[PDB]
Amino acid sequence: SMTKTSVDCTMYICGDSTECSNLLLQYGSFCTQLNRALTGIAVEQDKNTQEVFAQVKQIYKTPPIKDFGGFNFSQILPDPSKPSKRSFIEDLLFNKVTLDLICAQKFNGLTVLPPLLTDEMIAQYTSALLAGTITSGWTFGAGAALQIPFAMQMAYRFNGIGVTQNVLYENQKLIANQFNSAIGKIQDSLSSTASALGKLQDVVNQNAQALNTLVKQLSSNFGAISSVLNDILSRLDPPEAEVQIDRLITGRLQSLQTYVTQQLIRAAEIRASANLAATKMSECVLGQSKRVDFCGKGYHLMSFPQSAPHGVVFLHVTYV
Amino acid sequence: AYTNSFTRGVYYPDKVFRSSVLHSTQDLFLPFFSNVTWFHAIHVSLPFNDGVYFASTEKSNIIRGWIFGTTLDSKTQSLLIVNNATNVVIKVCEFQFFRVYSSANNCTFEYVSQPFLMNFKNLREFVFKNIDGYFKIYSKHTPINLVRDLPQGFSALEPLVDLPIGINITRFQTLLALHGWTAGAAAYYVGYLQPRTFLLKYNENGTITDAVDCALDPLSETKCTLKSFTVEKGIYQTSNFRVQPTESIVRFPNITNLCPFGEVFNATRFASVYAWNRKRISNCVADYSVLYNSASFSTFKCYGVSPTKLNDLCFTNVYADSFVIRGDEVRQIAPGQTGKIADYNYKLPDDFTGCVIAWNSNNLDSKVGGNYNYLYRLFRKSNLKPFERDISTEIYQAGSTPCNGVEGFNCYFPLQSYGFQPTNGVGYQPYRVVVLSFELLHAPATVCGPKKSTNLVKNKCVNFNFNGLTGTGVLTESNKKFLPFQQFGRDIADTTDAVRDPQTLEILDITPCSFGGVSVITPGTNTSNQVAVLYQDVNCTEVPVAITWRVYSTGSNVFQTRAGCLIGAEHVNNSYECDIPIGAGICASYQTQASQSIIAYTMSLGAENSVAYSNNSIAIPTNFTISVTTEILPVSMTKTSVDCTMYICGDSTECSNLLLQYGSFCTQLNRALTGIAVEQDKNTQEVFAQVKQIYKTPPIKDFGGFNFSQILPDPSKPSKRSFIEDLLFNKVTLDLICAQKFNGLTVLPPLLTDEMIAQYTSALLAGTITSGWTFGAGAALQIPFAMQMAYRFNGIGVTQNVLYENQKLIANQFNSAIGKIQDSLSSTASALGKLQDVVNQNAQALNTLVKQLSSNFGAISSVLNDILSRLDPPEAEVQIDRLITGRLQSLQTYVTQQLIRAAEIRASANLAATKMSECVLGQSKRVDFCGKGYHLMSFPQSAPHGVVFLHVTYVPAQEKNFTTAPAICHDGKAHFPREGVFVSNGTHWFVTQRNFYEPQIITTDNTFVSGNCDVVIGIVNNTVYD
Amino acid sequence: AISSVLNDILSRLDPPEAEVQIDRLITGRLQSLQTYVTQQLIRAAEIRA
Amino acid sequence: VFKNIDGYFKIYSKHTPINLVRDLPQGFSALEPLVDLPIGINITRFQTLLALHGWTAGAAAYYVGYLQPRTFLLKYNENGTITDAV
Ligand SMILES: *[C@@H]1O[C@H](CO)[C@@H](O[C@@H]2O[C@H](CO)[C@@H](O[C@H]3O[C@H](CO)[C@@H](O)[C@H](O)[C@@H]3O)[C@H](O)[C@H]2NC(C)=O)[C@H](O)[C@H]1NC(C)=O
Ligand SMILES: *[C@@H]1O[C@H](CO[C@@H]2O[C@@H](C)[C@@H](O)[C@@H](O)[C@@H]2O)[C@@H](O[C@@H]2O[C@H](CO)[C@@H](O)[C@H](O)[C@H]2NC(C)=O)[C@H](O)[C@H]1NC(C)=O
Ligand SMILES: *[C@@H]1O[C@H](CO)[C@@H](O[C@@H]2O[C@H](CO)[C@@H](O)[C@H](O)[C@H]2NC(C)=O)[C@H](O)[C@H]1NC(C)=O
Ligand SMILES: *[C@@H]1O[C@H](CO)[C@@H](O[C@@H]2O[C@H](CO)[C@@H](O)[C@H](O)[C@H]2NC(C)=O)[C@H](O)[C@H]1NC(C)=O
Ligand SMILES: *[C@@H]1O[C@H](CO)[C@@H](O[C@@H]2O[C@H](CO)[C@@H](O)[C@H](O)[C@H]2NC(C)=O)[C@H](O)[C@H]1NC(C)=O
Ligand SMILES: *[C@@H]1O[C@H](CO)[C@@H](O[C@@H]2O[C@H](CO)[C@@H](O)[C@H](O)[C@H]2NC(C)=O)[C@H](O)[C@H]1NC(C)=O
Ligand SMILES: *[C@@H]1O[C@H](CO)[C@@H](O[C@@H]2O[C@H](CO)[C@@H](O)[C@H](O)[C@H]2NC(C)=O)[C@H](O)[C@H]1NC(C)=O
Ligand SMILES: *[C@@H]1O[C@H](CO)[C@@H](O[C@@H]2O[C@H](CO)[C@@H](O)[C@H](O)[C@H]2NC(C)=O)[C@H](O)[C@H]1NC(C)=O
Ligand SMILES: *[C@@H]1O[C@H](CO)[C@@H](O)[C@H](O)[C@H]1NC(C)=O
Ligand SMILES: *[C@@H]1O[C@H](CO)[C@@H](O)[C@H](O)[C@H]1NC(C)=O
Ligand SMILES: *[C@@H]1O[C@H](CO)[C@@H](O)[C@H](O)[C@H]1NC(C)=O
Ligand SMILES: *[C@@H]1O[C@H](CO)[C@@H](O)[C@H](O)[C@H]1NC(C)=O
Ligand SMILES: *[C@@H]1O[C@H](CO)[C@@H](O)[C@H](O)[C@H]1NC(C)=O
Ligand SMILES: *[C@@H]1O[C@H](CO)[C@@H](O)[C@H](O)[C@H]1NC(C)=O
Ligand SMILES: *[C@@H]1O[C@H](CO)[C@@H](O)[C@H](O)[C@H]1NC(C)=O
């Protein structure tokens, strides 16, 4: 998803001028279409989050006795100690992405609507998916969740990639240690470098840059005497005050239209990414995929979703 | 006395017929549910502001007319209406208040026509308006039983007469007429109109049947915003709220001394143009009234600063340049204007901010002998750059020779002064011009207007003014460190964020008064009428300070969340599945708390459960459900074609030849739209035309109990579609189309007709049910449907024996599933949401495009013929070019939105083609791609601009607990299931498939050996049969 | 505008009227560039698909 | 800093006490505006003026730079002082 943005014509284009409001209400069609497009984008962001995460009928809970034949999922399962019911890796991902100019954006009528799902409930959805994956396997994706030992699920995932299940049982401890060391390496890589969460960070940066550019467009004169309407009203009588105001309105409305069009294209690319993420949650998390290099490099075994600021992280487990 | 107007004060906005259309109007109306005055007129033996509504139940007219004017004392022309038995008389004259008036010294208007008035007291509603000197009367007559004053009911007032009076009306009075002067009683009702936005519903007969007051309550606000009398359950973003300021604060430096600009106005001698004098005027007060109070001017001329407004601005610094000019040269001081004195004497920069005052000076400057004292030079090396002086009285070589010394041949010093005479100056007489040139709002202002400063307020949003910088918002103590020279503080958005107090030097931060989104949460308008209001990202401690609808602001139910403050819903602790999302995990519903009310709560993410994971516990299903689920996918959209010429300007040759220069833009638009249309045809071809041949179902439709009658075509119907296809076609609703066509927006029919699309779908159905997946690869190979189903079962890891041993049960499940699909499609209209909203998006885009023609884009009108009729050729062209740029921008916006919509539709069509390839033409392994569960097959069904997949899926059910082991050790060697899992009922062990409980004896065939039982963790002991 | 070439506008006009023509010309050309960039963004989205 | 544009002469100034290290250290500071005068006069050349307390022999030194129309980037601190330039 991306930051659900809302814009008021009156606040942005006209500030708080009655005369500007009366000159703008004639362009009501343009403003209603802009609001409709942005509302569509915001509802689409909520739908994207729902489609990616809310794929499960019930919220499952991991059992208190976390014995999975040597596979220790403590870094990915939620920790009751922390107030925020997230995992160690989820906490690292949350800290890595960085979210004054927001106050100026708010004061210029450009607001950020909060997502319908809070980070807590997104983490709870992710935790339910994790519990279902580690206790039931692919069965909870189809119908009723059917419990199965994690060893047997691993034997099944091995059988899926054309490796006889005897290999995993005869090397259970070795595979468990390899998986644990891999999770350790994920933790170290996430803690050390800031280039890990590039995509989410640049998405946030694109949204912030778009809003900053939009707020900077208010300094543009658009061929008027000045870029501030209040001094235009104070220093001019109506008969040319209004022609200066309408040129300013046309300029700012064009800037808003450009912003909304760029947001529509960005939302289309984000929807493509969200459809891909929903497909990956269906085919990699809810089951074992045969599509080569879809769920990670090598023979895909399983995946673990992890919530991240306006995105998801798949821990693609692969046999190499 | 007072009373409540429920639904009175409604009239037909204009003499225009309509039918079955909800029209939004913005005009003077009597607000709904208003405090109307119940007037009682008694004899012992009113301001007319913004229209008036008058209601009379009275018979035997004691009101025999009305009076209107501004003074009603013959100082201004008065209007009177008087009524008697047979007719009415209207008179507009100088009336001095026929006992009513004394004499008519000046009459301008009289009118005589048919009378306007036509315990069973009956209402004669009247509306009196005056706009642009036109006085309009609306009326309506209704009989009532006289239960009480202003009953419940709806009726509009049809217009009777409009008079072009063109006089000032401020106050109006009702006559008390007597046939003695006996005592009497009367009673009538008075309402005041206000500028309001109403929604009017027109019947088939074009009568205004009902109205909605958009600006009375949140529910009617949503009704007006959606332009509908019915609002679906949900949340709708209405107009934004803004906390209004309390008062006005003006802070100017305490300077009281007067600016002697009057001194330069009546100077004894004005410096000549070559040596014109300027001085800074500052640290005092300035006014534009004393300049003509001392002496009337002749010419006022200035750019960017209106003469009236300069009293309200404070000036950083101003310079006054006063000098004597010849009468004919008054227009030489304009920026950009060139000439002799402009180029050689004085000229000012093009971007000059200042005002010029010129007046006659012949009686003070002209002499009988000629005043040869006002010198000016016409000789120089080159032009004089603006705001520079040349006073060197040296000989200029005007001729080809270097004229040096005292003088030269045809070479002259600065030109001799004019011989100005009092009488010889007929148009050439000397004038004095004074230019005030200034820059403002860049430096700390020192010279201000007569306006006085006011007291400072804090923590309360006001209309603050600082040396002419005027804004609105709260002021706070500043933590910033300004510097002595610094006066303003700006932000990234080039807007003031801190200001310096001109009287106390104190710095104050500026914060615009609190505001935010207003959303209205409603159930179905049919279900209820009480609503909730969300103020987005607003502290709940601030909206009580904001105590236009204030009915809900009473509070007592206020709930605070991250999304904002919610009013009119009761927060509850328990969690339900959420229908109306508020934000930040808050959802609103309407249910019983036995009374119904709107509640808000934390959304549940579904039923909480803990899957019984253990060491050796597995859950194996013993039964299944053949679940058939509908997946709707848009495939194409309405192929649109637009021609610039007719849309941008129909049947206008002048507009056509001004537009032909934008041929490149028009060709690009046509190319984009043609690309979109050919892409729609390609989308339909890619999705449907995936078969080389059109296959036909056999007449003997025997498919081992599977009944495909509802999906196979019926030859009886002319369009050879199926029952489900017919239901889908009826569900989607496809006049405004005529107007769209007539404005140059045409809809090209799809290349494939619905008949051939249905034939393609029928061919796919026949191929699927007779051949299976084979017809997708190469030549269609016939196969019994039972065995195709056995193959689909084998595909999802279920042994084919399951289907054959349960053939009748699976057939009945499939038939009942199809029955449920039929019932669901017949009952609810929310089934085909996606196709319907795609059609709605296209219709809304075209309606918005056709409505853009009403936009003026800064023109005198929107229609081009009126522009040509009401304007001269050049003004007509300079308006129509801007209008064509505006309409071309609207077309470009439409085409860009269509390109993005077509991209999303192409994504959907590629997904639909992939689903037809992987779900219809074969069995897919991709989880949750071809429906929820283990996909078996799919059936395409044509639908308006889309496809419907009847995803048949296997869903396990009736699971049972079992004890399980990862391997079996029999003779010191581990045993593993070939394809299955080991389970124990409590005494014996069995091998079973993973998706259907069927135990088998553990033998050598279903198990394979690997190593020994000392390495495997959790191996158990049992026996294996040879 | 008076013409489509800036050089003749500069040659035939004193700065103020020259600039009041040039700003309209710049708005036109900037709108053309914006249209081109938007069409390129949509084409690049389809190419990325 | 001395400028004259359209007959307006502006002065900028600053005082910075410096050590005995060397001429023109790496020190950075901006000049606050003092006064503008309506000169309205053609200016092409300037010369500075010296005082003598006689005519006792002595040595002194100053520095002259010529301004150009250039584009700068200025960084403002929390106090609004121009801290750095590019
Ligand atoms: C499951 O895997 C967990 C991740 O490897 C592991 O958590 C780690 O446990 C050890 C204790 O054995 C902690 O070690 C630290 O202990 C104290 C208190 O925090 C510190 O002061 C020490 O410096 C030391 O680092 C780790 O902090 C902890 N987490 C990590 C990331 O290593 C569990 O112990 C494993 N449990 C089982 C049953 O397998
Ligand atoms: C499978 O059994 C589990 C629990 O095992 C039970 O343990 C003993 C108490 C004894 O009764 C055994 O025969 C059982 O196998 C069931 O999990 C519980 O289900 C109930 C609902 O009936 C629920 O209230 C509990 O919370 C569940 N306990 C846990 C720890 O989750 C489970 O329902 C059984 N599965 C099926 C399909 O019936
Ligand atoms: C629209 O007007 C027509 C014409 O008056 C109405 O038709 C009449 O309806 C009444 C009541 O049903 C009948 O008694 C008359 O015989 C009808 N006359 C004719 C000529 O048809 C019609 O009912 C009106 N419709 C609405 C919705 O107001
Ligand atoms: C599997 O479930 C089906 C129903 O989904 C069972 O079919 C029912 O059987 C009972 C008893 O014979 C009948 O009364 C019902 O009419 C059947 N339902 C339907 C829809 O036909 C079936 O018996 C179950 N299988 C087993 C082995 O118990
Ligand atoms: C498939 O189902 C349909 C509807 O459930 C059956 O159609 C009915 O057939 C009977 C006998 O031919 C008629 O009396 C009804 O009028 C039909 N109803 C409808 C709605 O069409 C059809 O018979 C079933 N096919 C088979 C082979 O049993
Ligand atoms: C577990 O399944 C076995 C296999 O059928 C059951 O054993 C049979 O029980 C019946 C009834 O007592 C006997 O007639 C058979 O001779 C037994 N067969 C064998 C091979 O032992 C056993 O009863 C089942 N137990 C439970 C608890 O379901
Ligand atoms: C399964 O059976 C085998 C042999 O019948 C058991 O193996 C013996 O285990 C005991 C105790 O661990 C040892 O002292 C013997 O040396 C083992 N014998 C052999 C031949 O390996 C085994 O313990 C049984 N499984 C369980 C869980 O008790
Ligand atoms: C901004 O200006 C203030 C006041 O001139 C500076 O605040 C002083 O900072 C020094 C060093 O940290 C402290 O020792 C003083 O106690 C502070 N005084 C006050 C009144 O706050 C501040 O340091 C300046 N900013 C910078 C970056 O130097
Ligand atoms: C109408 O307003 C008057 C004046 O405030 C008040 O006295 C009267 O009670 C009001 N009546 C109603 C019905 O609001
Ligand atoms: C009504 O008044 C008009 C004008 O005063 C007069 O011409 C007319 O005769 C009167 N009619 C009656 C019936 O009083
Ligand atoms: C306002 O008047 C007071 C008292 O006369 C004086 O101290 C103050 O300087 C004046 N304000 C300004 C801005 O000079
Ligand atoms: C509203 O303002 C008060 C200050 O009294 C503050 O305590 C509270 O946190 C604010 N509300 C929210 C939701 O932050
Ligand atoms: C919800 O429960 C809390 C205690 O946890 C209580 O304070 C609160 O009053 C409850 N909510 C309502 C609406 O009563
Ligand atoms: C889980 O399985 C292992 C492997 O046999 C066993 O050692 C452990 O005791 C089991 N745990 C429980 C609680 O039965
Ligand atoms: C200013 O003086 C210079 C130096 O000779 C001269 O070339 C120039 O022409 C003068 N400016 C004007 C406007 O005459």
Residue numbers in the entry:
A (entry chain B): 727 to 825, 845 to 1065
B (entry chain A): 27 to 71, 84 to 135, 157 to 177, 185 to 245, 257 to 624, 632 to 677, 685 to 825, 845 to 1136
C (entry chain C): 969 to 1017
D (entry chain B): 193 to 245, 257 to 289
Task: Recite the paper's sentences.
The SARS-CoV-2 spike protein is now a well studied trimeric viral membrane protein whose symmetry can vary depending on the conformation of the receptor-binding domain. The spike trimer has three receptor-binding domains (RBDs), one per monomer, and they can adopt different conformational states and thus dictate the symmetry of the protein. Soluble spike protein shows a preference for a bottom view on grids in the absence of an additive. In this data set, we observed that there was heterogeneity in the RBD domain, and hence C1 symmetry was applied for the rest of the analysis. Subsequently, CTAB was added to the sample, imaging was performed on thin ice and side-tilted views were obtained, which resulted in a reasonable isotropic map.
In this study, the effect of physical and chemical factors on the orientations of macromolecules was investigated through an analysis of selected well studied macromolecules, and important parameters that determine the behaviour of proteins on cryo-EM grids were revealed. We performed a comprehensive examination of how macromolecule orientations respond to alterations in physical factors, such as freezing temperature, and chemical factors, such as the addition of surfactants or the presence of affinity tags, during grid freezing for a standard set of proteins.
